[PDB]
Amino acid sequence: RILNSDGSSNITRLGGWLDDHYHDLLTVSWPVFITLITGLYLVTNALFALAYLACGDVIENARPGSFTDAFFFSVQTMATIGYGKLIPIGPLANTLVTLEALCGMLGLAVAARLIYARFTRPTAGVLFSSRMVISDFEGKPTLMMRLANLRIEQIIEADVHLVLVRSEISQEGMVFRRFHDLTLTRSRLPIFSLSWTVMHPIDHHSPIYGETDETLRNSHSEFLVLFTGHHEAFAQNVHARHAYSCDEIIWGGHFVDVFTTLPDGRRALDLGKFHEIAQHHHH
Amino acid sequence: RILNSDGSSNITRLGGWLDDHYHDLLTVSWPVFITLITGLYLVTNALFALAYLACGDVIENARPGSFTDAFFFSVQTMATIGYGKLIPIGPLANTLVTLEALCGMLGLAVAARLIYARFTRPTAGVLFSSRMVISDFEGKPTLMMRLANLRIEQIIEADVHLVLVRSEISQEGMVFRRFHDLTLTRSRLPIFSLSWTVMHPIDHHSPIYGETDETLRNSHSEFLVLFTGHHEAFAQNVHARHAYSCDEIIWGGHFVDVFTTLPDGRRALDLGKFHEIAQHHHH
Amino acid sequence: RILNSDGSSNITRLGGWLDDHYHDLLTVSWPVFITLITGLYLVTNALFALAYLACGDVIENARPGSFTDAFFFSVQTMATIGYGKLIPIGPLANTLVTLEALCGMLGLAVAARLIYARFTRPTAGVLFSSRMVISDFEGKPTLMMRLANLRIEQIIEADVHLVLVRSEISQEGMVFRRFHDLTLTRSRLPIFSLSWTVMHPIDHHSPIYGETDETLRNSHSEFLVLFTGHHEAFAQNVHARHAYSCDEIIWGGHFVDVFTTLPDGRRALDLGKFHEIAQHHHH
Amino acid sequence: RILNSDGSSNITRLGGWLDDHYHDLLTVSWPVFITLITGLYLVTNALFALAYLACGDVIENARPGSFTDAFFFSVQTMATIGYGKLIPIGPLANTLVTLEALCGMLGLAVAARLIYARFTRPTAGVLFSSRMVISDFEGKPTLMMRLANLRIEQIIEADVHLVLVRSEISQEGMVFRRFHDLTLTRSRLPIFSLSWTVMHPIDHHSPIYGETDETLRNSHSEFLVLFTGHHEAFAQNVHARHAYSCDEIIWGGHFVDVFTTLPDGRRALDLGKFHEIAQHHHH
Ligand SMILES: [Cl-]
Ligand SMILES: [Cl-]
Ligand SMILES: [Cl-]
Ligand SMILES: [Cl-]
Ligand SMILES: [Cl-]
Ligand SMILES: [Cl-]
Ligand SMILES: [K+]
Ligand SMILES: [K+]
Ligand SMILES: [K+]
Ligand SMILES: [K+]
Ligand SMILES: [K+]
Ligand SMILES: [K+]
């Protein structure tokens, strides 16, 4: 497989610590992110502790020269707790308190907004069919796959972009992976609530015209699907990607109706039937 | 009705606690959201209270072994109030204070940003006409519905996507709901301030060409409308959806002019006339 | 004038307190917004003051029954200042402190995020020419207007949508304002840095084909311009709107080159020349 | 060069302090931004210090008339530290504390949200080839340039807009820079993971049809590239711009394959080969 089932590439890649700070703060794992924020919080409070000590004995009820007492006073100042046992003395420590309160209020507000950004990533909650089918629709062979909304809230302006990716030999003897846009009957669904079957009519303008299971395997053909939409639950845009290889196309298959009948005779959506494909079996 | 008047589906659906945390935090009711935040706030302060107690008697002016005194000290630390009656003693409680201040400052900032997200959902403030009409416009039968901006602020790049949804029998005997895009005379209005009448000319390319009130009812025809736009009041995008059934089309009707004359002879917008449709009555 | 110079409508409009809370919190004036936030802050602290008093004398160093002492203790609790002169006594006041700290931390965080939203509205910083011109370009009469970027930072994917708005009589004797999209030579400028002249070639497909200054005045013709783009300074989308009446079209005029020569022989942009139009004067 | 390599213009520009506050707060340098926030923090605390003094001796444990003691009490109130040595006396200072806590909580929250906005600007992390090439592709001369994703995370709905910018003489003897959209074989790549070669087939509809290296230099031809896309790492849109002059087009050159073979026989992406162009050398 060139592309994984999720649509990402398998190709190995090659060719400063804070050179991409924002990206790294978002993509780094939660234990790493936590260590970074917690360590920065502790390192800043250790730097102010040393600063208070460099002024002399400028913290009331603190043991002279005690870093521990200066650190805990710094925490009480930076977090703006201010119990009042450890309190600043003179213009030097009060100036440092004024600087530290500002750093803590600003820096902890930024750290908290970064936690929120990492936490509020919306997921499309869209299910792609495990396979694609090739069967006749309106008297023409048609490539199909389907999507379902896994949530109760609607996706507005839902778009699907289907692309064929195959190996080709150019007119000047150049071997390369080419990307062919597959024209869909409907690429935009204004309101996506339940199930959507995406169709590519295989006409003389289709890059898979006259193609068989065998010819798709020789060009190492792959089908890449991008779904985009605005999700009403999040009041944000969402996307989902997927990839099918040549062996995931059921030639002559048709998708089973997902709309089932409940015991009370009601019409329901059964996503148990979502990956079910019907085929004709010969002797 | 397959689709409700708001554009949602009526179909019954089937086929972990924190498996969709962000969606559930946004879509859950306000009393439930409040119980969750308040309970998490109280449970965290109860966990730190127990932690302070596990260290021994490390809170000044607290009754030894008192959970109540340890809980209220935890609240005073986590909220960063720090009155100074209940104060930490030793390296163990001061370390817990340092950890608790961080959790509270970060966690309460995230909870507050989540309240803001739930509170700042923009509404389009767009009124859809209670009916659609079918009457001649520029010598051609035309399907129409109308929208009005209920607010003083404008919607920029306003888009309308009108779709017919009917039951159909495919060439291979497949019964299914098909979605037909209805081509509008104008689908984009760069600046939407007052009233907008949306028109679908019923020409030989229209899916409702040669269709009558009777034929629309036999295919269980429905009309789905999606409105999108950028709202100047919110400096955010907005949308609105609506649905009409076959019995909500006034055949031969025309919308009444909404621009009324005020006593001072001034031209005004009267949204009292917005749902008024004029029809010819025969003997 | 039907439409003002800024693109808004002049039409008079007609046809619950917290029924549109979010819109009203954004569009209300700053003195009103401030009164609302400040009053809510003061009313909440007065409600907790009364609550503390209803428990009895549960505030140390407070005068029994004093609302003033209970109010200032509430402020010290809700703002999380906690000096430590006024401190809570018993399980009742400590429970109220726990509730009040939560309300204040959450509610003041939301109020502050609302101030930021009202404060960070981006302006396009785009100058529209005071007039439009009609003159020959590539041997065809062309309608033109121009825009300039007033800032050093670029606007990416800049779009212009020009529309004619005139009064018309329909085939069934209906008088109405019709919106005609005016097709531009270029409606998209990927990178907008300096000046952009927008052109509508008046060909047989133009709604202003065969139109004169006189015929535009009889239909009360107006030209509405919408500019949209992504601003690099804000890393946000921006828009600007404008409107021209029939008397703001210079028939036969051409815009003066804005690129001037500086004393050091350097080529500069002179936005002093931006509204300058050249015309031929006859005897 | 009219346009720099980054796509910005070189043209010199000409033609109130808080007249563009939000833009200036985002585009101003970090030392300037810090001085502004820090100075505003210090000036506000100096104004409350003076206010407390104007009431008389209304701060316990403060030296009468001492601005230093009133300033540090103001810092302790505005930051909500509240140690409890300097505490307010009477209805006048307690009213000022109530006002100051509100200002500090709101104003410091806004300042912190502004730091976050300045800090969380996403970069596309896209590499443009140092040159463009003109060589035959599918038996037609084709203009090409290429882009690579410098990060592991994908860009979804990646768009490329290529424009020619040359000096031209109009039919009425007008010399001006004209912007020609160059039609690409593929302008949209739904999922951009590795390398993308952008192609403009030079057919009879191309503005560079029949053009040579010499004719492109006489019109001072430049090629402007805009890349846009949605970045999965940031869950935000991104863009990148670039510009090529006439001397940056390798006539007859073709880009070298970036997909290299690793010692374990694995296929890898070598961005060391990204700027490598192959050419035929004659005697
Ligand atoms: Cl925020
Ligand atoms: Cl935000
Ligand atoms: Cl096709
Ligand atoms: Cl049609
Ligand atoms: Cl035209
Ligand atoms: Cl072309
Ligand atoms: K505090
Ligand atoms: K405090
Ligand atoms: K305190
Ligand atoms: K205290
Ligand atoms: K805070
Ligand atoms: K104290």
Residue numbers in the entry:
A (entry chain A), B (entry chain A), C (entry chain A), D (entry chain A): 13 to 27, 32 to 299
Text lifted from the article:
These studies, which involved structures of both closed and open states of the channel, identified global conformational changes associated with opening of the lower helix bundle crossing (HBC)4 gate. Second, interactions that link the second transmembrane domain (TM2) and the slide helix with the cytoplasmic domains (CTDs) are crucial for translating the twist conformation into opening the HBC gate.
To observe the effects of the S205L mutation in the context of an open conformation channel, we therefore created a double mutation (S129R/S205L) in which the HBC gate was engineered to be open and in which the direct consequences of the S205L mutation might be observed by comparison with our previously reported structure of the KirBac3.1 S129R mutation. The channel crystallized in space group P4212, with one molecule in the asymmetric unit. By contrast, in the S205L mutant structure, this interaction is replaced by the novel triad His177-Asp197-Arg202. Additional electron density was identified within the cytoplasmic cavity consistent with the presence of a potassium ion coordinated by Asp175 and Glu173. We examined the effect of these negatively charged residues on the electrostatic potential of the cytoplasmic pore by comparing the APBS calculations of the S129R mutant and the S129R/S205L double mutant. This analysis revealed a significant decrease in the energetic barrier to potassium permeation in the cytoplasmic pore at the level of Glu173 and Asp175 compared with the KirBac3.1 S129R structure. The results presented here show that the S205L activatory mutation in the CTD stabilizes KirBac3.1 in a novel high-energy open conformation and highlight an important role for the CTD intersubunit interfaces in the control of channel activity.
